[PDB]
Design a protein around this nucleic acid. Structure first.
Ligand SMILES: [Mn+2]
Length: 721
DNA sequence: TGAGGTAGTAGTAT
C-alpha cells in the first residue's frame, strides 16, 4: 500500500561516470562515427561524448581527447551527459527489445488490430540531472497505422488526391510526407530527378525484397516536403492513421481501446521498463526503483476545502442543492428564438417559454429574481431560416432590442455547426464582442431531451403562470440527470450576469493572486492576465495582453503597466494594499524578475512566483499489494525540494487515469507547502460548472479568456462560460 | 454549443 511514480534514480553519480570527450574547432562527424563504429554518442556545439572510445575516426582529427569525469558546475556538460544517457538507452532499446524511433517516442509491440487499423504501444523517455543525481522519467502512449498501401488503394478504385499525408514505414525506418501529384512516369521510365528509374536505383542500392514486389502495374507518386520533392512508388507508401482521418466507427472502437485503467497502464509501463533495464548496463538501479522513497519524494495528503453560499458547506453540490447564492440580484433576460425549431423539430415558442418559466422557478429559490424583457413582442417572428444566412446583414438593427440584457439564444445545432452559416461564432463575436452583451446558447438537443423526460412522466398541460405544475416538474427533475444540465445553464447565466455563486469558506495564506497565461498560436499571440482579488475567490479585473507575439517573453514595459494596474485595482476595491501577492504562470517563467522586484518593493509587498505545468508527462498511483491493483487519491502531493506533483481530480475507469499537475516555486518568500495548498484550493472555484475542474481558477479562466480573445469574441467580467 | 474529466487529436530517405 505504497506510492509509485514513473521515474528512476540511478545508483551512480553524475561525476562518477567515466566518459570520453572529443573537441572540434559537428552533426556529420557524429553521423559518420555512428555509421562506422556502432556506438551511442551525443553532440553539442563542438563536443562529442561517448562511453567507449571510437575506433575509426573516418578521417577526422580532434585537437584533444580526454577520458574523465564531467564538471557538474557547467550546464553544458550536464546537458551533454543527459543526451548521451538518453541516446544510449534508445540504442539499447532498438537492438535488444525490437523498438523503432517514430517521431519523438519509441514504437513497441502491436497490441490490437481493428478493421485494417493497427494499434502500437509506445514510450518516451526523459533524462535530468538533479544535484549530482541522474533521474530517468518515462511515459506510455499509443500509435496507429493502416494496413493497406496506396497501390492497394488505387487497385480498389479510390482516387489519390493532393494534400494527403502519407507515411513510409519499414523495419527501423519511418518517414512522413505529403502527396503532391500522381505521376504517369512509371517504374520502367527513368525518373527526372533520380537520373534513372526506380528499379535501377533500387538494384544499384540492392534489390533485397523490394524489387520482387515491383511490377509494371504499380504507379509513381510525387512527394512534396520542404523543397526536396521526392518521388517513388505506391507500393511503399501508406495513408496516415490519425483520429482526425479515421472513420467514425473506427474512431469509436479505437477510442474505446486506448483508454486504459490505472492498473493496465502502470503495469504495462513498468513491465517494459524492467525489460529495458535488464539489458542496459551503463547505470544500475534498485530491485524496485519505482517507489517515491527511491526517488527522494515526500508524501502529503490535502483535504477538501469548504465553500460559502450563505452558510458553510462541505461540497459545492450540496450547497447548490439546498443553499442560496453568495451574491444574488436581478437579471434581465431575452429570447432569440428561431422558427427553425418549429419548422424542423416541432418545438413551439410556448414550450420554450415554459422551459424558461421552469428556469425562473428554479432560480427564485437561490435568491435570484430574473425577469423576461418586454421587447420580445415587436419582432415576433424574425429569426427565420433565411435570417441566419444573412446574420451579419440583419444583425445591426437588433442592438437596441437586446441592450443591457442577457440573451438566451435558442439556435438549432445545424446553424451553429454548418460552415456556411457559422451561427455560434458570429453570435459570440457580435453579442459578446461588439456590444459586450452576455449570451447563453442552447441547442435543440437540450430542449428535446427535456421534452423526452417530460413525456416519460405525466406531461399534462403546462399552463402558463401555473405554480403547482412547475413545482411538480421541478420535483421530477430533482431526481433526473437533466438536473445538472439545468444547473449548468443557470450557473452560466449567473456568471455572465454578474452573480457570484460561492466563495471559499476559509481565507488562503496569500492575500492576492495574479495569473498569467500566454497561448501563442498562428501569427497572433493573445494572452489573458487575471487578478483573483480575494483570498476568498473573488475576481476584480482582466487584461487584454495581446501585444506579445511568437510566444516570447512578455515585454518589460507592458508587464510593468499590467502589474501596476492590478495593484491599483486591489487598492481601489479594498482600500488598502495587499501584504503578499502570489503569481501563477502558465508554463515556464521567462519574464524579467528585476521589474517585478522593483515594482513590488516600491509598494512594500512581498511576492512569490509559481509555475504550473499542465502536462508533466508523468503518472502517480498507489499500489495495493493485497489485490495487485493501482489506484489514485485526490489531493495527493509528492514533494522534492521546490517541485511537487498534485493529484487534483478523480475520474472513473471509463475515461482513463488522472493527470497530475506539476508545481514549481522560483522564489523563497513563503513555505512551499502553503503554495501547494493555495494552488489546490483555488481549483474549487468552478463557478460556471457543477463538476470539478483540474487547474486552479487563476489559469483555467486565464486560458479560457485567452482562447476567447484569440478567436475575436465592477461590471460583468467572466462572459466565457 | 449544459459542463467537466482523459488521451491523443497534443506537446536524408526516392
Ligand atoms: Mn458555456
Amino acid at each position: 500500500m505504497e506510492a509509485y511514480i514513473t521515474e528512476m534514480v540511478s545508483r551512480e553519480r553524475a561525476n562518477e561516470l567515466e566518459v570520453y570527450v572529443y573537441v572540434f574547432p559537428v552533426y556529420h562527424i557524429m553521423r559518420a562515427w555512428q555509421r562506422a563504429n556502432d556506438l551511442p554518442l551525443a553532440y553539442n556545439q563542438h563536443t562529442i561524448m561517448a562511453f567507449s572510445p571510437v575506433r575509426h575516426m573516418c578521417g577526422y582529427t580532434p585537437m584533444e581527447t580526454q577520458k574523465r569525469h564531467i564538471n557538474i558546475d557547467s550546464p553544458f556538460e550536464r546537458a551533454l551527459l543527459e543526451r548521451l544517457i538518453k541516446n544510449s538507452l534508445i540504442f539499447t532499446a532498438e537492438r535488444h527489445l525490437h523498438a523503432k524511433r517514430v517521431g519523438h517516442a519509441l514504437r513497441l509491440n502491436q497490441v490490437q488490430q481493428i478493421r485494417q487499423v493497427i494499434i502500437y504501444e509506445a514510450i518516451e523517455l526523459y533524462v535530468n540531472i538533479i544535484e549530482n543525481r541522474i533521474s530517468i522519467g518515462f511515459h506510455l502512449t499509443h500509435q496507429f497505422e493502416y494496413v493497406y498501401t496506396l497501390q492497394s488503394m488505387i487497385e480498389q478504385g479510390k482516387t489519390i488526391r493532393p494534400g494527403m499525408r502519407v507515411v513510409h514505414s519499414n523495419g527501423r525506418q519511418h518517414y512522413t510526407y505529403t502527396v503532391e501529384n500522381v505521376a504517369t512516369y512509371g517504374v520502367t521510365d527513368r525518373c527526372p530527378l533520380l537520373q534513372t528509374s526506380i528499379y535501377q536505383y533500387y538494384v544499384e542500392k540492392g534489390a533485397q525484397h523490394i524489387l520482387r514486389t515491383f511490377t509494371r502495374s504499380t504507379r509513381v507518386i510525387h512527394v512534396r516536403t520542404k523543397e526536396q520533392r521526392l518521388s517513388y512508388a505506391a507500393t511503399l507508401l501508406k495513408p496516415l492513421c490519425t483520429f482526425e482521418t479515421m472513420q467514425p466507427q473506427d474512431v469509436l472502437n479505437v477510442s474505446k481501446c486506448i483508454k486504459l485503467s490505472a492498473s493496465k497502464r502502470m503495469k504495462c509501463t513498468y513491465r517494459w521498463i524492467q525489460q529495458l533495464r535488464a539489458q542496459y548496463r551503463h547505470l544500475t538501479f534498485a530491485p524496485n526503483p519505482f517507489t517515491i522513497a527511491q526517488n527522494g519524494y515526500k508524501l502529503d495528503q490535502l483535504s477538501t476545502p469548504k465553500v460559502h453560499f450563505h452558510r458553510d458547506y462541505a461540497t459545492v453540490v450540496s450547497g447548490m442543492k439546498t443553499g442560496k447564492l453568495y451574491k444574488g440580484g436581478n437579471i434581465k433576460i431575452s429570447v432569440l428564438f428561431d422558427e427553425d425549431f418549429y419548422l424542423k423539430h416541432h418545438i413551439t415558442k410556448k414550450d420554450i417559454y415554459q422551459f424558461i418559466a421552469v428556469l425562473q422557478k428554479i432560480a427564485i429559490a437561490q435568491g435570484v429574481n430574473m425577469t423576461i424583457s418586454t421587447s420580445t413582442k415587436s419582432i415576433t417572428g424574425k429569426f427565420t431560416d433565411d435570417f441566419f444566412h444573412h446574420f451579419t446583414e440583419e444583425v445591426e438593427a437588433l442592438q437596441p432590442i437586446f441592450a443591457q440584457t442577457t440573451v438566451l439564444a435558442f439556435i438549432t445545432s445545424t446553424h451553429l455547426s454548418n460552415k456556411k452559416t457559422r451561427s455560434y461564432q458570429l453570435l459570440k463575436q457580435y453579442f459578446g464582442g461588439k456590444w459586450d452583451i452576455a449570451s447563453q446558447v442552447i441547442t435543440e438537443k437540450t430542449i428535446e431531451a427535456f421534452q423526452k423526460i417530460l413525456h416519460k412522466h405525466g406531461l399534462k398541460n403546462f399552463y402558463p403562470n401555473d405554480e403547482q405544475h412547475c413545482l411538480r416538474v421541478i420535483d421530477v427533475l430533482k431526481n433526473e440527470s437533466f438536473y445538472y444540465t439545468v444547473m449548468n445553464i443557470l450557473l452560466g447565466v449567473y456568471v455572465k450576469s454578474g452573480i457570484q455563486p460561492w466563495i471559499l469558506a476559509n481565507t488562503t495564506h496569500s492575500d492576492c493572486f495574479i495569473g498569467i497565461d500566454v497561448s501563442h498560436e498562428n501569427g497572433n499571440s493573445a494572452a489573458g492576465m487575471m487578478n483573483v482579488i480575494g483570498s476568498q475567490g473573488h475576481l476584480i479585473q482582466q487584461a487584454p495582453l495581446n501585444g506579445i507575439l511568437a510566444g516570447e517573453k512578455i515585454d518589460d514595459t507592458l508587464l510593468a503597466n499590467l502589474l501596476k494596474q492590478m495593484i491599483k485595482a486591489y487598492h481601489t476595491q479594498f482600500q488598502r494594499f495587499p501584504k503578499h501577492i502570489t503569481i501563477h504562470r502558465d508554463g515556464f517563467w521567462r519574464e524579467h524578475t528585476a521589474l517585478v522586484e522593483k515594482i513590488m518593493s516600491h509598494y512594500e509587498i512581498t511576492y512569490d512566483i509559481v509555475e504550473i505545468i499542465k502536462k508533466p508527462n508523468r503518472r502517480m498511483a498507489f499500489f495495493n499489494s493485497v489485490d495487485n491493483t493501482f489506484s489514485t487519491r485526490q489531493g495527493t502531493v509528492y514533494q522534492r525540494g521546490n517541485e511537487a506533483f498534485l493529484c487534483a481530480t478523480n475520474p472513473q475507469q471509463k475515461v482513463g487515469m488522472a493527470q497530475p499537475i506539476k508545481i514549481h516555486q522560483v522564489t523563497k518568500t513563503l513555505p512551499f507547502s502553503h503554495i501547494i495548498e493555495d494552488v489546490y484550493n483555488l481549483s474549487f472555484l468552478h463557478i460556471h460548472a457543477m463538476n470539478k475542474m483540474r487547474l486552479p481558477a487563476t489559469i483555467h479562466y486565464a486560458d479560457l479568456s485567452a482562447t476567447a480573445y484569440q478567436r475575436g469574441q465592477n461590471q460583468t467580467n467572466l462572459p466565457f462560460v
